[PDB]
Design a binder for this molecule. Sequence first.
Ligand SMILES: [Zn+2]
Lengths: 214, 74, 309, 288
Amino acid sequence: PSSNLLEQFILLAKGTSGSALTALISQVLEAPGVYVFGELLELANVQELAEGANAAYLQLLNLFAYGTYPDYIANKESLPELSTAQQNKLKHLTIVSLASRMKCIPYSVLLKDLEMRNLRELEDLIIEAVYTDIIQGKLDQRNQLLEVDFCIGRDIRKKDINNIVKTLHEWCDGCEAVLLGIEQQVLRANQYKENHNRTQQQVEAEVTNIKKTL
Amino acid sequence: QKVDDDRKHEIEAAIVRIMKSRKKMQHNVLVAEVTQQLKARFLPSPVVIKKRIEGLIEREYLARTPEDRKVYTY
Amino acid sequence: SIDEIYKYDKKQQQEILAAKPWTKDHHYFKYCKISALALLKMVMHARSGGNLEVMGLMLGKVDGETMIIMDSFALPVEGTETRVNAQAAAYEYMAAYIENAKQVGRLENAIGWYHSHPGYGCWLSGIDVSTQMLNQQFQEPFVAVVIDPTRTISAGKVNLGAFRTYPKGYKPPDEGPSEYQTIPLNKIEDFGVHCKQYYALEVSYFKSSLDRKLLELLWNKYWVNTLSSSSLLTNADYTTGQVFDLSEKLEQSEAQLGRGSFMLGLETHDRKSEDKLAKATRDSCKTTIEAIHGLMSQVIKDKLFNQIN
Amino acid sequence: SVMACGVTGSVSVALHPLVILNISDHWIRMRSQEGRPVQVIGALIGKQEGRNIEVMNSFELLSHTVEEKIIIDKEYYYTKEEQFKQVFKELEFLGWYTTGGPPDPSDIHVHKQVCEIIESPLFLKLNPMTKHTDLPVSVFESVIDIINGEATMLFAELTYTLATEEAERIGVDHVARMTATGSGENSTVAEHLIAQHSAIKMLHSRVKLILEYVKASEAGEVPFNHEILREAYALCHCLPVLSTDKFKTDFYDQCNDVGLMAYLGTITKTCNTMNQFVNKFNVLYDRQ
Ligand SMILES: [Zn+2]
C-alpha cells in the first residue's frame, strides 16, 4: 500500500502545501514502505518549497532521494532531527546503494559507512531490512561479508540520467560487438566448411581422373 | 475348497520366491523351472499356469505390459 | 542444392526396381537418410501416451546404396491389436492413404516399417527379424526402423536404429560392430540369439528445410532462454557411460589385435579391428564437440552478463 | 479489405509443432514438384472444449483450380475424415490452413466453402518467404460485417498460443540437437552461434526500448515513471554482476576441465588419422 499512499500524498500536494506539506513529508519519511521518493520530488510544490523560505525539510528530502547516511550525519545540524523510522529508512537506502554498487559487502564497509559501533546492531538492521522485502541476499559471518543477491534502486531525476544513458550506450555497444563477433565466427565456420568441401571434390576429381586413366 | 486355496497361494509364493532370486523368460523358459520346483507337489497344469501368469499384467511385479506381452516390469 | 532430394523421378525408381542391384550383394544398402518430418512423426507416434508399443509404415525411395525415408503414417489398431499383428483394418487404410497422396502430390511408395521399443533399446527381436525377412520377400528391399521414446528421456537423445536382415542360411562375412547396448534381463536373451541375423545401416539426416525450421522454432520460443546453467552435461552419467563404453571397446580391440598378430593371413580380423577403432574414435569426437559447444554458449553469455560494463 | 478492424479474438487457439511441420512439408514438396512456391491447402484437426480450441494435428486436402477458383475436393475431405475416424476419434475437424503472405481474394472463397462444411472453421496462413525473426503463422476467424449495406465475410486475427506436451518438447529438442549435427558435419557451431545470436538480439532489442524511453523521458513523456525508471536504473547497477575470487576460481576450473577434454578429443581424432595413415602406408610399400 506504499504506492497508493504515495499517490494520495502526490494528489494532496497538488493542493495544500507549506506547513502541511512538511507534515506530509515527515509522514512519508516515517511511514514504512516508501523506498522511492522520485515521485514526490517532481511535484511543482516541491519546487515551490525550493523557492520557499523553509528549506530544512526540502534538504532532508533531497538527501533521502540522492544522499546517504554519512551525508545526513554531516548535515545533522542543517536537517530536521530524524525519528527511528526515518533513520532506519535512510540506513536501508544507504545499504541499498552499497549493494547496488557492489554485491558482496564486507562488514567493515557496513560499520564505517553507517556509524555502526556494534556488529549485533548491524546484524539486526540487516535482517530487518531483508525481512521487509527490501534486499535479498546471504550473510557470511566467517568472512565478515554480506552477499546481496538483489536490491532495490534509488531515485533518478537530475544528474544520474546521463550516467544511465552512458551505461545503456555501453551495453548497446557491447551487445553489438558480440553480435558482430558471432557473425564473424559464423562466416569463419562457413569458410572452414567450404575449405573442407574444397578438399573434398579435389579427392573425387583426383579419383575420377585415375579411373579415366585406367 | 480351503486346501485348494492353500495350494493356489502356495504356488504363487513358490513362483515369486524363486523367480525373484532367478532371471526371466521371453515366451516359455520360466515355466520349466516352476514345473520342476512344483514337480514334487502335483501336476504342472501348463494351461492353468499359462492363463494365470498373464492375469497379473493389470498390475506390476514383473507383469508383461498390456500393449505387448513381452516387456515385464523389471 | 538442399531441396534436390525432394524431387521424385518415377522412371528412375522404376529403373532401379527393375535392376535390383541388392540381389547382387546382401550388404548393398548401407545408408539410411530420414527426413526431419518423418523422424519427428515417428518419434511423436512412438512417444504417443508415455511408453506405448506402436508401429507404422514409411514412405520413400532408394538412391544407390542409400534408403531414403520421406514420410511415415500409422494403421488402425482396434482393442490394441486384438487380432494377429498390429494391422486389423490395415490394407484399406494403407491403399486409401497411398492414392490420396498420389493425388495431393506424395508419389513416394512404401520403403519400410517402423516400430517402437519403449525402454529396451533399438534392436530387432525374433518377431521383427521374421517380419523384415518377409518384408525382404514381398516388397523386395524394405528397412526396419526402431525408436526408443523412454530412452529419448533417459539417454537424452537416442538414434532411430535402421536395420536389414540376412537371408536364411547366409553368414555375415566378418561384420562385427562390437556395439554395446543396455538390454533388460527379459529381453537380452532373445537379443543375443537373433542379433547376428541382421545388420545396422548408417542413419544420416540431409540438412534440408524441415530440420532447421524446428531448430529455429524451439530456440525462438522454449529454448530462447540459453541460461539453464549451461551444462546439463555436468551430470556425469551419460558422458561417463560413453567414456566407460569407449574404454571397453578399445580394450577388446587390443585383445583381439594382440591375438591376431600370431595368425599370419587373417584379412577379416584386420578390417574389423580397424573398423572398431574408427567407430570408437567418432563416438569420442561427437562427445567432444558436444561439450565444446556447451562451453562456447557458456563463455559468450557468461562473459557478457557479468562484466559487459 | 478482407481484414476486420477493431474485432478482438473470441476463442483461444492452441497450436502444436506437428501442424507447422506438416504445413512446411506440404509447401516444400509442392515447391519441388512445380518449381515456384505453389500455394498449398490442407485441413486442421484437434480437440475443442468450449471456447478453448487445441489444434493437435493437420493433414492435406485435394484442390483443383477451375474458372480461376480453388475448389476443395470436399468429397476427398470427407473420405479422409472417415479414414482418420479409424485411427483417431477424439480429434475433430477445426479448420483449414494455407501458405502465403497477406490474405488474397482466393482464400476467402476457400474459407467460405469450409464454413459451408462445418459450423465454425479456423483459418491459418503460413508465410514461408518471411524475413523477420517472428513466427510467420497467424490464425484468423470468420466474422460477418455489414460493408456498404452488404454482409461481407472478413478475417479477424486471433491471439493464438502454442501449446505443447513434455513428449513433444523432448522430441523437438532432440531434433534440434540433431540439426546441430551436420551431414558428415555440415554446420555444427553455425546453428549454435546463430542460436545465441537470436537470444542476444532479443535482449538487445529490449535494451533499445529502455534506452529510447529514457531519451524520450528526458525531453517529454512522463518525467518519472516511478518504480519503472527507478528499477531500470537498479538493473543497470546490477548489470556488473560482482565476481569474487571463488567464482573466477570455479569459472577457470570448468574451462580447464572441458578444455582438457577437448584436448583428449583432438588426440583421439589424431591417432585415428595416424592409424589410417599407418594402415595405408603398410600397403603402399611394406609387406607382411
Ligand atoms: Zn521390436
